Design a protein around this ligand. Structure first.
Ligand SMILES: [Mg+2]
Ligand SMILES: [Mg+2]
Ligand SMILES: [Mg+2]
Ligand SMILES: [Mg+2]
Lengths: 267, 267, 267, 267
């Protein structure tokens, strides 16, 4: 494990990559001895830097939820990253494509907390008690590191993703807010349209068998750092679709059936 | 368009590939001038051979329904193949892995016809009127041609798949039979488990915007050949999930919610 | 009744049996005058030892919840055991078969407590008041004593099972969490699949007429020992199916209908 | 295979066994080379004799509808028997215990045919088309052959059960008649009470994955004998519970929830 100053240097390089919209070499290639603990330490430093610049923490996301993507990576559980205020775009918004590098859209559910959640021993049941509203949410993900020879599996890529604030870039909330007990969250389903054609469909149970499961897991991950999920935070639970590339000119419309819809346009 | 003898020659080679469980070189590589008309002519010949051997036509399938698949296959419409009696396995069956080469499982809805459907001008409404029951159905697909050839590493094409009876191999019907009008077919959703873990999820609208659409399209495609979809036939409308590889020892469970489930095990 | 030292030494022998995956002779054959209270004292010592090793108490289970199972065990009421943190597996997990001796799977409902339950005079209504959520739960049960005695061929007795922490080994929570008032718990039903075939089915009322009844009974049983069911504990109420053997390679899928599903694979 | 005369004489012996309520030696022990087809031939002769006496065929039952029951019977498919008019008792009837030898109660769904079903190629969909109503049904089963051989202690075999008209003795229809399309038959569930205590519970999908599947299977089994399922016949599809012994003084109550109940008392 590296000393903090190494984590800070890597964070500064990610920060410049984001600002210039120019990718850097995969962190795990430049730092072949990097550990998962180092990766989260890099993330923490970068988030710290971005908050010092004037951003505010608004929540978190859980990623790498599919067992398939978990299997091919160096780890055997999901990942997480921090959501900042400048990542949020309004339902129906024009999104500036130029701000991103290789943006892709994911289909998720978000949990808006009424009460804090703290580990250890946080459970699904604690999540239900603490959740004010569940609402559909799109995530816009991106990559500040190059991915060389993408067809060749390289498990240590997960360290890059984690360092790179779990690929965070954007969030679009929309549709129908519900109390968590209103209906069975496992069977919420969605159709993702891009430019008027369905590109992906999915069902929420594809996220960790229950789309709220990652929230409890996250609270438990954060506990050792003396961090909790705070009241008012928005927690994105994970995607039940493969991400779909967003290009300038694209319009997205994601239909969650009786849970409403979310739209945006890339300009 | 190749001569009658050449179609039969290709069909016999596909037939040998299936019987021996030994893939042949892509048809498009040995025959670079192959057209889509040729491909269907080859399929017809192979089906003729297999019926002459003692099999019976039980229905048809529609494939290449997604936008991802149509673009990558370089085609602007779906494909189709013929379903024979020996392709059908019972719900909950042991499936002999050794019978197949590279089997993969798809998640579909099947339409069981009470009345014939004939083109041209077959509509979605005709399909509703002619359908006795809709039932969940898994398709087991396979490939008798190499995906990447030993000699040149060149990829397999859409002509190869179509010639190869649209990748047909197996069908597993199960779950809950319904009249077409019982509920909105567009929103039927499914969770595909392999070995207890969700590998894919999907919603039926991902099949041509309405899972009955392919049935009408198919009747219209067959009209020129003086062929119709016959009463009693089972028509598989297309997959709302990417295919998932089946290996010896795998248990599949596909949960269609209020439409029931289908299971099998590869032995 | 035996002295405290004997309870401790029997518990140590069971602990070694579990650790080494090697069964010991039925305790009741070595100790012909063993009482039900002795059996619970052995259980308490074993739980104490495991907690001393760093384990944490997470809840309890109730067993022998059929009049038929009670008759076979020559007892007139259920039994209970303690659930420790290391017994819990995630929904969809690989379960290490080598960790167990003769594992079997049961189908249950779990009660997650928001408030403590203390005897005497704990009622069904107290259980409803104290329960935060009900969630489907599988129990993985095992046996550290021989069922058929190597020397005498005589069978294991209820004293052996109770001493052996009521056959406890594993727990798998999954599916849909509900408030106890959401629907009639009595009519929750389930299909247990092993390797894609239904091995057992059952309905929750098969557990003591109402799956919450065992929880009240348990609180009342524990009162004389100055023990109560604590807030945050998970209480498994009993199986509505006969247990089904788990072997290496087995995939389990348990379908509780509108209450969701739980799966796992033995590896 | 035995000659026709032997089938007749075995049937006469079973007929006397039933009349006298005195078991005979297991047929398979007297006839070690007995085949499944011999067993069905004995059954056919017995049915013929009973009809000659003035009885009328009212339908059929399907048995051994579990993979587990099939394994115990060393068979790879269900069995069947014929239901005669004098086997039917009214809901809430006193049942004369003295008429039977070792009676046991099973919990089933019955299919009342509006149209005939003939093999080969009878499907689930044909069953739905031909079924007028589905109604809960209890089966009273019995055994005219010793389970444990007086001389050798050897057990009864499947050939014995099939010869013995598939253990047929009584049928009790009751509860709520529904059109097959009214609800999902797979999820009909039941609680069997004997003397006010639940002895078994079960769900209809436990019968061959779908309680109508046995009906199609049966039509296909009967086709080679130039027999079909006739309009107006009642077909019992299989038990979703293990049979429960009936003794003089026993009251049975079987609760199918929203499908109604069936009761009887043994006197
Ligand atoms: Mg995401
Ligand atoms: Mg298909
Ligand atoms: Mg249990
Ligand atoms: Mg029966």
């Amino acid at each position: 494990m590296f000393d903090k100053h190494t984590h800070t240097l890597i964070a500064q390089r990610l920060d410049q990559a984001e600002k210039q919209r120019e990718q850097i070499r995969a962190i795990s290639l430049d730092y072949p001895e990097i550990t998962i603990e180092d990766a989260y330490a890099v993330q923490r430093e970068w988030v710290r830097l971005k908050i010092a610049e004037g951003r505010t923490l608004k929540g978190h996301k859980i990623g790498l939820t599919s067992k398939a993507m978990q299997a091919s990576s160096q780890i055997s559980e999901p990942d997480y990253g921090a959501l900042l205020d400048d990542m949020f775009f309004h339902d129906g918004s024009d999104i500036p494509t130029d701000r991103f590098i290789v943006p892709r859209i994911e289909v998720e559910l978000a949990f808006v907390l009424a009460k804090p959640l703290r580990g250890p021993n946080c459970t699904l049941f604690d999540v239900y008690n603490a959740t004010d509203y569940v609402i559909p949410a799109l995530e816009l993900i991106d990559a500040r590191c190059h991915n060389i020879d993408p067809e060749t599996q390289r498990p240590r890529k997960v360290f890059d993703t984690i360092s790179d604030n779990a690929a965070n870039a954007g969030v679009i909330l929309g549709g129908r807010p519900i109390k968590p007990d209103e209906l069975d969250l496992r069977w919420i389903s969605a159709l993702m349209y891009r430019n008027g054609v369905i590109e992906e469909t999915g069902v929420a149970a594809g996220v960790l068998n229950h789309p709220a499961n990652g929230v409890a897991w996250l609270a438990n991950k954060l506990a050792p750092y003396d961090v909790q999920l705070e009241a008012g935070q928005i927690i994105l639970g994970g995607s039940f679709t493969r991400p779909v590339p967003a290009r300038k000119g694209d319009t997205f419309h994601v239909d969650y059936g009786n849970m409403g819809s979310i739209s945006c346009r890339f300009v």
